[PDB]
Enzyme design. Sequence first.
Site, PDB file in Angstrom:
ATOM      1  N   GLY A 149      -7.558   5.121 -13.167  1.00 10.64           N
ATOM      2  CA  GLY A 149      -8.599   4.212 -13.597  1.00 10.64           C
ATOM      3  C   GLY A 149      -8.930   3.185 -12.532  1.00 10.64           C
ATOM      4  O   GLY A 149      -8.075   2.775 -11.728  1.00 10.64           O
ATOM      5  N   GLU A 160      -5.214  -6.730  -6.831  1.00 13.98           N
ATOM      6  CA  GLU A 160      -3.885  -7.324  -6.925  1.00 13.98           C
ATOM      7  C   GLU A 160      -3.786  -8.611  -6.103  1.00 13.98           C
ATOM      8  O   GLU A 160      -3.407  -9.665  -6.618  1.00 13.98           O
ATOM      9  CB  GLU A 160      -2.881  -6.276  -6.447  1.00 13.98           C
ATOM     10  CG  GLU A 160      -1.444  -6.552  -6.728  1.00 13.98           C
ATOM     11  CD  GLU A 160      -0.611  -5.337  -6.434  1.00 13.98           C
ATOM     12  OE1 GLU A 160      -0.180  -5.164  -5.262  1.00 13.98           O
ATOM     13  OE2 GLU A 160      -0.402  -4.539  -7.378  1.00 13.98           O
ATOM     14  N   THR A 212       3.756   2.396   2.925  1.00 10.78           N
ATOM     15  CA  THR A 212       5.138   1.918   2.932  1.00 10.78           C
ATOM     16  C   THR A 212       5.943   2.169   1.658  1.00 10.78           C
ATOM     17  O   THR A 212       7.076   1.672   1.572  1.00 10.78           O
ATOM     18  CB  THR A 212       5.180   0.408   3.223  1.00 10.78           C
ATOM     19  OG1 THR A 212       4.492  -0.299   2.175  1.00 10.78           O
ATOM     20  CG2 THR A 212       4.511   0.115   4.588  1.00 10.78           C
ATOM     21  N   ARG A 261       0.871  -1.175   0.000  1.00  7.92           N
ATOM     22  CA  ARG A 261       0.000   0.000   0.000  1.00  7.92           C
ATOM     23  C   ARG A 261       0.907   1.223   0.000  1.00  7.92           C
ATOM     24  O   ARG A 261       1.587   1.497   0.996  1.00  7.92           O
ATOM     25  CB  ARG A 261      -0.942   0.006   1.210  1.00  7.92           C
ATOM     26  CG  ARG A 261      -1.795   1.297   1.334  1.00  7.92           C
ATOM     27  CD  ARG A 261      -2.918   1.351   0.270  1.00  7.92           C
ATOM     28  NE  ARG A 261      -3.285   2.733  -0.071  1.00  7.92           N
ATOM     29  CZ  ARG A 261      -4.227   3.435   0.553  1.00  7.92           C
ATOM     30  NH1 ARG A 261      -4.944   2.911   1.535  1.00  7.92           N
ATOM     31  NH2 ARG A 261      -4.456   4.695   0.185  1.00  7.92           N
ATOM     32  N   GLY A 262       0.903   1.958  -1.118  1.00  5.88           N
ATOM     33  CA  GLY A 262       1.851   3.047  -1.293  1.00  5.88           C
ATOM     34  C   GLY A 262       1.826   4.046  -0.156  1.00  5.88           C
ATOM     35  O   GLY A 262       2.867   4.418   0.384  1.00  5.88           O
ATOM     36  N   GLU A 263       0.629   4.476   0.237  1.00  9.38           N
ATOM     37  CA  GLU A 263       0.521   5.525   1.249  1.00  9.38           C
ATOM     38  C   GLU A 263       1.160   5.107   2.563  1.00  9.38           C
ATOM     39  O   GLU A 263       1.658   5.958   3.306  1.00  9.38           O
ATOM     40  CB  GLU A 263      -0.947   5.899   1.462  1.00  9.38           C
ATOM     41  CG  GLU A 263      -1.157   6.905   2.603  1.00  9.38           C
ATOM     42  CD  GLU A 263      -2.624   7.152   2.934  1.00  9.38           C
ATOM     43  OE1 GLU A 263      -3.074   8.304   2.742  1.00  9.38           O
ATOM     44  OE2 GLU A 263      -3.323   6.203   3.376  1.00  9.38           O
TER      45      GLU A 263
END
EC number: 3.2.2.6
Length: 174
Positions: A45, A79, A17, A13-15
Amino acid sequence: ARTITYDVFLSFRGEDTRFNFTDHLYSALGRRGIRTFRDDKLRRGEAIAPELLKAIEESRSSVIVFSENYARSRWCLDELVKIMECHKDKKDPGHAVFPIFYHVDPSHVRKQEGSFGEAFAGYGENLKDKIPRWRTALTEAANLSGWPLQDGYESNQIKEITDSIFRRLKCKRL
């Protein structure tokens, strides 16, 4: 025999780590010679990008950096569904899955409680037919042998994880 491009697909999860823990993990994997896909592209998208589905299909394994807000992203959950599909179906070689629980309780992931439960409460009826497959994939991944991480020095924890993955992947490569 199926096409193989990466040793590891890194799901995160980018936000939570992107710039810290998962970046250090990514560069440690490469220092071990483990070819790793870590998405760094701008994405737009609702649907998961085809390039990501293809990277998973062409990876010998995935490493899942479970973190507090992972289930708050529909892209992370789609994913994960693709990863656990390959884990079940992909043969010669398999698709191994290595879950890291980065300051999260495995039980929260497994049962969709705590912050993972809150995420599911936040989704609406727009996505109600995705929710069953999302739950199954979180439960299956959380039932796999992995690394719960909370206390201690992170550099040595990453070293041990990547040594373990290196050995498990080299033995399978035979």
